[PDB]
Amino acid sequence: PTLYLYRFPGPHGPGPYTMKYWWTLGCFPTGMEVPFRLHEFLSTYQQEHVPVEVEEWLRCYIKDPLSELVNASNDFFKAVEVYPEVESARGYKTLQPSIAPLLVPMKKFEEQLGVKISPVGLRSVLSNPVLKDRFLDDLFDYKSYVEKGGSTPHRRLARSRFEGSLPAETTADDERSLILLLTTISEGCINAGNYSDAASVLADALMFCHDPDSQATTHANISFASLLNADFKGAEYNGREAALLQPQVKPTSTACARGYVGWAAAAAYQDDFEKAEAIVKDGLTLYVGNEHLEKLANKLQALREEQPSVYKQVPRSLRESRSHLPSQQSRGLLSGSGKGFSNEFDWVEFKNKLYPS
């Protein structure tokens, strides 16, 4: 004459031990509770439902991308101008004013332009006085250029789709100012200490430039950012792409020399000191005079003076083992396997090893 209720919601409300059943089995494990999901039905299906004719006519009244870019750039410039300057105290570092009203205009600019900008990088370039001036000047130049001569990336995409349905000139002034301000933001982000984010920003910043000198400079900057982020593979790739663009660069630009430096440093971090010395030798034979190459050559020689005294060379099975820079330490602090929490012995990963995917 008694009833059996395995697991029912308590007096205060349904807990996770019952919501797990609610999401997997479909209802509570007792069966006495009727499944009622009207709220989530209204939140999902009633919202995503759109009639066919209205769905088809929606694409006719989308906003004009040129006007959207102009308005977003205007509002973002107004916001970054209204943003106050940090007052420097003496004895303690003053907390920079948090960017509360800057996230919305920056987000609109990002979703209109197709590139992502770091909030930490924006905060750092606003804290830095000279970087703030560079960013403001570049943003005003970009505003004037997109208001006077349209959007060069949008026109390039339109011409690309047109030639696909049926060449590439040099970079325009708007794209030049854009890559300039993106490099400024990346420099601020590096000063703040987010190397992965800086590399991710520069990876999309390189897409706007088409001239060989700008591409070589962006490749050198990406090589340095990846070197600081401990992504030696991409660092070396960009560093050698700089020297690949070298034959078409102006004689006054040292972006290719910086790319040589980044490539040699990536080799040194990969522990191929012979390859790094060969790379810096080639770089010196190219540019006999360059401090970025000379300092690195001196450091590599100072290391090579002691290299044969310990093991006569670096081992083969022990390469890319010693963690040098703290960026990979900071990344492993989050991506590391815990003690008894998440590892090859925990079942949530053991089943991932067992099953194909």
Partner: peptide
Amino acid sequence: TSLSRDPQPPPSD
């Protein structure tokens, strides 16, 4: 990485 594109002409009258 594709930009926001231009809306389409009216399909019908």
